[PDB]
Design an enzyme around this catalytic site. Structure first.
Site, mmCIF file in Angstrom:
data_model
loop_
_atom_site.group_PDB
_atom_site.id
_atom_site.type_symbol
_atom_site.label_atom_id
_atom_site.label_comp_id
_atom_site.label_asym_id
_atom_site.label_seq_id
_atom_site.Cartn_x
_atom_site.Cartn_y
_atom_site.Cartn_z
ATOM 1 N N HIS A 483 0.854 -1.312 0.082
ATOM 2 C CA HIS A 483 -0.181 0.045 -0.098
ATOM 3 C C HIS A 483 0.834 1.372 0.065
ATOM 4 C CE1 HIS A 483 -3.884 -1.697 0.872
ATOM 5 N NE2 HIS A 483 -3.235 -2.863 1.050
ATOM 6 N N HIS A 669 1.209 -8.278 -3.207
ATOM 7 C CA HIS A 669 0.181 -7.960 -2.558
ATOM 8 C C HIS A 669 -0.890 -9.236 -2.407
ATOM 9 C CE1 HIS A 669 -3.681 -6.410 -2.103
ATOM 10 N NE2 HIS A 669 -3.129 -5.581 -0.964
HETATM 11 FE FE LIG Z 1 -4.196 -5.077 1.156
#
Ligand SMILES: [Fe+3]
Length: 818
Positions: A483, A669
């Site tokens: 992120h 991710h």
């Molecule tokens: Fe995430």
């Protein structure tokens, strides 16, 4: 002579109102220019009628007919202006000009014309490096980038499309309470941090350095993803959870309507079996909310039932095996922290003058290495560790001063057995010591045991390790490394690479929803007293711990082969297909990850040469040079002094940088995100916090370990109320929206007109399908059962490229999208 056109758009949520003088388009020539070298612009042309002939439309789209007065003398249209004279914004999908067809892929909200400083411009789907821009479009291309950059000032409004950077100075809430003040993360040597998207709300009244609160944390408009189905708006769920659901749960506990604590492991299992009984008005508050209502089954009256986590679907007890504890370090939610250990005892780099003597207390002769001596285990590369000692020790004193938080800085030693599985052989539970310490608690080493009080002490030792691992996973593997690290590249890309640019087209699918979820995270997840702080061990120290870790974040070490080599779990070996030899051969994350990595590498290596013939073509690309300079010097600017940043002067460097960005955003991710509820939906398997240290002999707490070991465990880990909230948030984060765009997919088949790029992309998608078949064969191979399935019998599917919607434990999105 008129050009026949078709506009496709989606109303914000009837069609005739778009006709008359509601919406005008003007074509702009790519080949024929005015006296200032700018492409000639056509007349304002309004939508003329609704097209109901086009069979494939779907998705709440409508099509409109339009005819443009356009002589061949005006050249070939390459762009258009659009003005919306209606009060309400609409979502522009595309323009298509017939009789080679010219296609414009827009996918952009168009607000009322009076809200825009300059008129919305859209380009046809051709791809150009700056030196290849048709001249009559050169100034339009640059002006549109200037518009996207803004001027670094002002409060951003919903309809703005302005990309810029700011520090994480918006997490504290000092105007509400001094207790909610937080350090600014970014822009100092004390707290380096990636930048985030600028919002410009201005300062709090109590602190000029902290940004005031806002009801909406802005993102550039087209970053704020609409969804046809409200159940797909998963990003809104954390906000609802913090703002509506968390207070509702709290009241149930305040009024003593449910037991405050779990009393047995069965009380935890009950959450996904018969459910939990809550006050009617608590169920009624929760049950009608979008997204939130999908998280629980209910009778509509008193019951909430969570879904059964994958980790217990075959054996509800297997999580407590030593085999599964170790297996999840290579195939669990956080499979990327384990390291090779090549000396013994393990060493610390921390200052003993501050923390006391840092020598490890683990003795080699105490360890069961299946008959190996320590020298044999070290030399055969069979010794590994999960080392949180130096990471956590600097924060242990301040964490342990909190009410209801107590942790150790842990180290776990692992042995790779001849059967190829990992076994845990010791856990060191370390505490800092300094002369004036009030606490008499000491560090200790705990070894495996299956019987008696020693087995309870060992089970608690594994819980302290997993609290360190869950904190590191959530803050570092997940939040910091995906992120937060990605957002600077999103901002730089829109600021410096035109929509026309090949590298913009290569990268941007891998940014979908990232700025949006991040802004919502700054507001409700990682804010002062937000979800993370109130559910995870470090409380108000959580986000700043991630800044400390970021001091050691290295862009080029995010490449999977470099990560594996750095952690001592692989060696360079150019005689192997991937150029690395795994030291744990059946390491599911790494072995599957290498396949995905290689597929992305082939794609980038095929795409790049379509636009760049020699190294210089990279040196002479002005947008590319400005992009990378800004990404490094502004976006990750606190680490601009570091020697390891690629310079971007060669084809090799461009491939490397793009490969690493796509890998972070997609497969890395996915592998750290979609296992969260599947593994952590049983709080005993993934505790988020610990609340007490090991008890002393001769105390009630020690007696409880003997007499009621499940209660001793539950009193040590996350309490029931934060468990209900943490389970709800990880359930949302583990869900695939039905409108997800996965690796090997794009949102539009016409993203470029370049057939060679389109062919290369089809080959990439085919290769990913081939890889999925291979990973299925791996999971079906009985020889790989120990690491790929374990005693939980959970096939490792987190790096399967494809998935259906829902909580599937598989599927690689293009982007950090949740
Ligand atoms: Fe995430």
């Amino acid at each position: 002579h008129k050009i026949k056109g078709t506009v496709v758009l989606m109303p914000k949520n009837n069609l005739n109102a778009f006709l008359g003088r509601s919406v005008s388009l003007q074509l702009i020539s790519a080949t024929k220019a005015d006296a200032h070298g700018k492409g000639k612009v056509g007349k304002d042309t309004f939508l003329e009628g609704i097209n109901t002939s086009l069979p494939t439309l779907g998705a709440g789209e409508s099509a409109f007919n339009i005819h443009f007065e356009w002589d061949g003398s005006m050249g070939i249209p390459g762009a258009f202006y659009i003005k919306n004279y209606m009060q309400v914004e609409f979502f522009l999908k595309s323009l298509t000009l017939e009789a080679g067809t010219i296609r414009f892929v827009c996918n952009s909200w168009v607000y009322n014309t009076k809200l825009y400083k300059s008129v919305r411009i859209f380009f046809a789907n051709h791809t150009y490096v700056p030196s290849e821009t048709p001249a009559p479009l050169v100034e339009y291309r640059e002006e549109e980038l200037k518009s996207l950059r803004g001027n670094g000032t002002g409060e951003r409004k919903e309809y703005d499309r302005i990309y810029d950077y700011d520090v994480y100075n918006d997490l504290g809430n000092p105007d509400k309470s001094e207790k909610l003040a937080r350090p600014v993360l970014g822009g100092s040597s004390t707290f380096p941090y990636p930048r985030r998207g600028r919002t410009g709300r201005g300062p709090t009244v109590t602190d000029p350095n902290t940004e005031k609160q806002g009801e909406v944390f802005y993102v550039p408009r087209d970053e704020n993803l609409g969804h046809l189905k409200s159940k797909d708006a998963l990003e809104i769920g954390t906000k609802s959870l913090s703002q509506i659901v968390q207070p509702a749960f709290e009241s149930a506990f305040d009024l003593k309507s449910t037991p405050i604590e779990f009393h047995s492991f069965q009380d935890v299992h009950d959450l996904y079996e018969g459910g939990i009984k809550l006050p009617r008005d608590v169920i009624s508050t929760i049950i009608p909310l979008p997204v939130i209502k999908e998280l629980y089954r209910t009778d509509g009256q008193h019951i909430l039932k969570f879904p059964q986590p994958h980790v217990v679907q075959v054996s509800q007890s297997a999580w407590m095996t030593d085999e599964e504890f170790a297996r999840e370090m290579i195939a669990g939610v956080n499979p990327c922290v384990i390291r090779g250990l090549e000396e013994f005892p393990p060493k610390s780099n921390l200052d003993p003058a501050i923390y006391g003597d840092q020598s490890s207390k683990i003795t080699a002769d105490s360890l069961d290495l299946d008959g190996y001596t320590m020298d044999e285990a070290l030399g055969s590369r069979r010794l590994f560790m999960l080392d949180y000692h130096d990471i956590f020790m600097p924060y242990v004193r301040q964490i342990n001063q909190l009410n209801s938080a107590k942790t150790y800085a842990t180290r776990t030693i692992l042995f790779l057995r001849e059967d190829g599985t990992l076994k845990p052989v010791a856990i060191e539970l370390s505490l800092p010591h300094s002369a004036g310490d009030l606490s008499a608690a000491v560090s200790q080493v705990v070894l495996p045991a299956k019987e008696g009080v020693e087995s309870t002490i060992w089970l608690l030792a594994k819980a302290y390790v997993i609290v360190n691992d869950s904190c590191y996973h959530q803050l570092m593997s997940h939040w910091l490394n995906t992120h937060a690290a990605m957002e600077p590249f999103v901002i730089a890309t829109h600021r410096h690479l035109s929509v026309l640019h090949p590298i913009y087209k290569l990268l941007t699918p891998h940014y979908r929803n990232n700025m949006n979820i991040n802004a919502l995270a700054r507001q409700s997840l990682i804010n002062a007293n937000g979800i993370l702080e109130t559910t995870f061990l470090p409380s108000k120290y959580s986000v700043e711990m991630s800044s400390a870790v970021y001091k050691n974040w290295v862009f080029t070490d995010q490449a999977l082969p470099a990560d594996l080599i750095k952690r001592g779990v692989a060696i360079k070996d150019p005689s192997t297909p991937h150029g690395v030899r795994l030291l744990i051969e059946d390491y599911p994350y790494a072995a599957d990850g290498l396949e995905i990595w290689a597929a992305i590498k082939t794609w980038v290596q095929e795409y790049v040469p379509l636009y760049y013939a020699r190294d210089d073509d990279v040196k002479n690309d002005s947008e590319l040079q400005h992009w990378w300079k800004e990404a490094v010097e502004k976006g990750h600017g606190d680490l601009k002094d570091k020697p390891w940043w690629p310079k971007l002067q060669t084809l090799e460097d461009l491939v490397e940088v793009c490969l690493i960005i796509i890998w972070i955003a997609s497969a890395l991710h996915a592998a750290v995100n979609f296992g969260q509820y599947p593994y952590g939906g049983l709080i005993m398997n993934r505790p988020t916090a610990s609340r007490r240290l090991l008890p002393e002999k001769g105390t009630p707490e020690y007696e409880e370990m003997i007499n009621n070991h499940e209660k001793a465990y539950l009193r040590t880990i996350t309490s029931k109320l934060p468990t209900l909230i943490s389970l709800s948030v990880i359930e949302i984060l583990s869900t695939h929206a039905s409108d997800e765009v996965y690796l090997g997919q794009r949102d539009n088949p016409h993203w470029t007109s370049d057939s060679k790029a389109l062919q290369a992309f089809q080959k990439f998608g085919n290769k990913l399908k081939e890889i999925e078949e291979k990973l299925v064969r791996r999971n079906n191979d009985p020889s790989l059962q120990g690491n790929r399935l374990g005693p939980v019998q959970l096939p490792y599917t987190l790096l399967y490229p494809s998935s259906e919607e829902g909580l599937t434990f598989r599927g690689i999105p293009n982007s950090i999208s949740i």
